[PDB]
C-alpha cells in the first residue's frame, strides 16, 4: 500500500536490494495509455471546382504583425539582417548524430 511515487504517469518503479545489500535493483516497466483515456480521431454544379488561389500581398508592417501574432513572437525576429551577418553565418555547420 506504500509507494514512494505515484505509479500512473511514466512507469511502475519497484525498488529492491540484493540479499548482500551491495546493489540496488529497480524494476520499471512502462505504463500504457488506456483506451478509455484516449479520444477518437477527428473527422459548382456547372463549372469545375476551381482551386482557390488567392495570396493577398501584405506590406512589411501587416505581414510582420500577422506572422508575430500567428507564432506568438515579436516583430524583431521577422525584420531582416544585413550582408555582414548574412555572410558571417555558417551554411555548412557541423552535424553529429
Amino acid at each position: 500500500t506504500y509507494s514512494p511515487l505515484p505509479d500512473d504517469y511514466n512507469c511502475n518503479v519497484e525498488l529492491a536490494l540484493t540479499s548482500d545489500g551491495r546493489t540496488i535493483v529497480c524494476y520499471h516497466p512502462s505504463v500504457d495509455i488506456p483506451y478509455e483515456h484516449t479520444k477518437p480521431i477527428p473527422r459548382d454544379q456547372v463549372l469545375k471546382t476551381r482551386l482557390e488561389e488567392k495570396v493577398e500581398h501584405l506590406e512589411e508592417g501587416p505581414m510582420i504583425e500577422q506572422l508575430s501574432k500567428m507564432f506568438f513572437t515579436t516583430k524583431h525576429r521577422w525584420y531582416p539582417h544585413g550582408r555582414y551577418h548574412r555572410c558571417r553565418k555558417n551554411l555548412n555547420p557541423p552535424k553529429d548524430r
Binding site: D32, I33, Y35, H37, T38, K39, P40, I41, P42, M70, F71, F72, R97
Partner: protein, 94 residues
C-alpha cells in the same frame, strides 16, 4: 548500417497499409487510431500523439504536427516493433 533506422535504409510509401497487411496475416484485429495526447491545435505549431490500438490494447504511439502525420509515424513505430528493428533493440555482436 550501425547508426541508421529502418525507414532511412528501406524507404516505404504506405506504412499503414504494410501494418494492416502484417496484422491481417498474423491474425489480429485491424488497428484503430486514437488521439492519445494533444497540445495546441489551433496554433501553427501543434503536437499530436496518436496511438494505434488492437482489441483495446496499445500497439503503437507516434508524434506529429498534424493528426495524419502522427498516425503515419505511429504506423512506422508499430512496423518497427513488429519487425524487431527498434531503437532500443540489442546491438550487433561483433
Amino acid at each position: 548500417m550501425t547508426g541508421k533506422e529502418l525507414f532511412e535504409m528501406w524507404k516505404i510509401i504506405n506504412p499503414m497499409g504494410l501494418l494492416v497487411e502484417e496484422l491481417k496475416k498474423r491474425n489480429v484485429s485491424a488497428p484503430e487510431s486514437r488521439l492519445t495526447r494533444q497540445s495546441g491545435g489551433t496554433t501553427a505549431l501543434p503536437l499530436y500523439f496518436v496511438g494505434l490500438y488492437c482489441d483495446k490494447k496499445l500497439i503503437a504511439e507516434g508524434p506529429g504536427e498534424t493528426v495524419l502525420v502522427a498516425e503515419e509515424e505511429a504506423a512506422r513505430v508499430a512496423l518497427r516493433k513488429l519487425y524487431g528493428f527498434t531503437e532500443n533493440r540489442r546491438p550487433w555482436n561483433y
